[PDB]
Design a binder for this molecule. Structure first.
Ligand SMILES: Nc1ncnc2c1ncn2[C@@H]1O[C@H](COP(=O)(O)O)[C@@H](O)[C@H]1O
Lengths: 427, 415
């Protein structure tokens, strides 16, 4: 029996008011026999039965525990929901006298530590003490990333970390006068919504940022900083990362599992900003040996640093390959990412040893313009067309997510072209 | 030579508008033959002569470069003073073609890395890359201390790190309802000035905070938090550390030198309240051997972690020994502290190997007049006897004697 926790982005960083309880249902992919899952919204049985049928996990051995709604409703495991005596009674009955062997959470937050303490199993949560002190936030800080990568000797685009406009203005100006565009980044921003590109020249693709600002001179920059500084600092709370932006780069990741015992490579892939990051392929294609070595060693070094200071959990090291072919690291992500269950479970467990050898994975966000009436409806159509993932041909679409009021698929194929073809058939 | 920078508390954390240039003149103690010293204010010659005669450094081999004044004046090495063309030219002249072998700064700040960049000697600054990304600030973060110590299995008072009022209220309520007093600490607070003690009971001794608030109950604390949170967070800029406070505790430090090659014990001491914090003793007295070992090994584990993440420089780990006898770490300090030149130079270089065996150092807070009268009376430090008062700054004294009782008699004499 393990306790799996489907928690969201840290309550300490942001109010999870938009959450609907859908994305964290990816937790089920990690479930193994006997496990107890804590989720904000009960998954549909059809989702559970499908996912468990593929992982080989006995569904009836699983228990799903859902807290009552909290101060922000049901969308996310807010702190008040996990402290609810009603929920705690439900949790203890789900345990049924069994010891908690391990606590696994999607996000390394103090609320998980709080839960382990309330349950009297802190020892089952690796890095518990670190987490009680809110150490897990380091996994989502770009400022922390910049310092750690630079200290560990991990290649980094030129730049700095700025707490004020005076310093920000100097570092932006240095980079712009070298003929480069610049990307500003919220310390704790999630995704490209937290970034802006600044350029002397118009017409750049908006890859990895919400907006492009064209700034002619020092005065235009003063004007920009005066207007956006509140936003860039989240109301004066956080610092801003300034770094050199490299147009037309491809985005890669190497993800690791950081335990008490040390650092272990989970997997690597490419995130396709095509022009939005709406698909990813694993493992990483089109790198030569030296670039793949740099991506993995770079990430590993970063993770060894994070391990040494006490971080425990999943760590995604994000990088770009520039048009000149240089691997530069751009951030880390301390959490179960969009990729984690895909290479770890779908790749290594469902597809098997052939994954990385004669099989790749291609996941796409449910295309806009695609519609499916329900989970069961999507599965039926896939099953009937013969495009549903078939455990003995090792080809086809794996349904990744629960019903979203469509779903989300992962195509397993010999190479990217083959998966891309599988997908056009799917309709 | 080596380039020695007498910089102050980071300009990124606070405006150093109150500095007068006096404290960073402790830089001179670290000066070795041929070095070049960057100071905000020129030291008196008599001070420079005096320090170098004790340290055995040849004074004429030294150069002091003082940047012109900057936006806050001459009191402190502000970023614009160190990027001044007039200052960079005067600095390259002081080198006169010599390569910079090592850069030593009093504070691990991004401006040091900028200066090393300007001069073309990034390789002479250990942790250069770390510092350009302002990683040195981690050495002044209590929020960082709390996580590092928790992760490193280093003992610390019960508590948490809080970003908002709701979690602070919870964690304060919990400690108070257990009957203990609580101390709130600004993430980047310099000294006790950034701390406040919360208690059910009035009259606690304010060791390490400079105000106490008596809070009867949950609504009283709502009121306090609603009133003080803006100050506690520096305008919602930083988080707040909530800790169990231990009254009547003694305060100790263990200081380490963190370089590429690893972690070296500098020294340890006590910060005495008699009744107030106006004196230091090194090495640490009145500790059992196991308490000293917990102090040093605690400090070491912590520094090993700081090392691994890239920090380079001086790191002082502060601890208290509770009335109950337990050693608990309370903060770290990444910088040359008020103690660093004392055990490292005055102790290990001036006094020699006997320091920590047959000599101890006592420093207390209450120029040629001090020197004259100390000389004429015979109380001035005598290399031949390894006893007497050392003038640490232009004044402040460090009494070298066999034990604390001998040091306190010497000071009484100096009255
Ligand atoms: N939780 C605590 N209990 C007792 N003393 C503390 C605690 N936290 C910090 N202190 C002491 O308060 C002092 C801080 O003041 P300063 O050294 O001037 O910054 C240090 O000596 C700490 O060791």
């Amino acid at each position: 029996m393990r306790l799996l926790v489907g928690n969201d982005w840290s309550e300490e960083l942001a109010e999870p008011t938009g959450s609907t309880g859908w994305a964290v249902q990816r937790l089920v992919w990690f479930a193994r026999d006997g496990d107890v899952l804590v989720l904000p919204v009960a998954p549909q049985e059809e989702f559970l039965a499908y996912v468990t049928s593929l992982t080989g996990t006995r569904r009836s051995s699983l228990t799903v525990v859902v807290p009552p709604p909290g101060r922000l409703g049901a969308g996310a495991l807010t702190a008040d929901r996990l402290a609810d005596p009603r929920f705690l009674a439900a949790l203890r009955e789900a345990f049924a006298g069994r010891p908690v062997h391990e606590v696994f959470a999607l996000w390394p937050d103090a609320v998980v530590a709080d839960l382990a303490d309330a349950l009297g199993c802190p020892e089952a949560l690796e890095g518990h003490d670190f987490l009680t002190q809110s150490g897990g936030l380091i996994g989502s800080s770009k400022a922390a990333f910049r310092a750690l990568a630079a200290g560990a000797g991990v290649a980094l685009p030129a730049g700095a970390v700025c707490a004020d406009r005076r310093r920000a203005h100097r570092h932006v100006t240095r980079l712009l006068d070298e003929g480069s565009p610049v990307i500003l980044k919220q310390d704790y921003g999630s995704g490209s919504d937290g970034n802006e590109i600044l350029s002397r020249t118009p017409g750049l693709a908006l890859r990895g940022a919400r907006a492009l600002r064209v700034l002619a001179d020092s005065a235009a920059l003063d004007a920009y900083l005066d207007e956006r500084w509140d936003w860039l600092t989240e109301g004066g709370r956080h610092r801003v990362v300034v770094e050199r932006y490299h147009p037309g780069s491809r985005a890669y990741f190497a993800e690791f599992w950081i335990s008490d015992g040390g650092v272990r490579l989970g997997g690597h892939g490419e995130m396709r900003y095509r022009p939005l990051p709406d698909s990813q392929v694993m493992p990483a294609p089109d790198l030569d040996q030296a670039q793949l070595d740099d991506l993995v060693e770079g990430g590993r070094r970063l993770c060894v640093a994070l391990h040494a200071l006490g971080y425990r959990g999943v760590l995604s090291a994000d990088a770009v390959v520039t048009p000149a072919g240089e691997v530069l690291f751009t951030e880390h992500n301390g959490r179960a990412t969009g990729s984690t269950h895909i290479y770890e479970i779908v790749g290594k467990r469902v597809v098997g040893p052939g994954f990385g050898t004669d099989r790749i994975l291609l996941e796409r966000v449910w295309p806009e313009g695609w519609e499916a009436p329900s989970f069961a409806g999507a599965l039926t159509r896939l099953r009937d067309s013969g495009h549903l993932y078939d455990p003995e041909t090792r080809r086809g679409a794996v349904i990744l997510a629960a019903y979203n009021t469509g779903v989300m698929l992962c195509y397993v194929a010999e190479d990217l072209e083959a998966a891309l073809h599988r997908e056009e058939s799917v309709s």
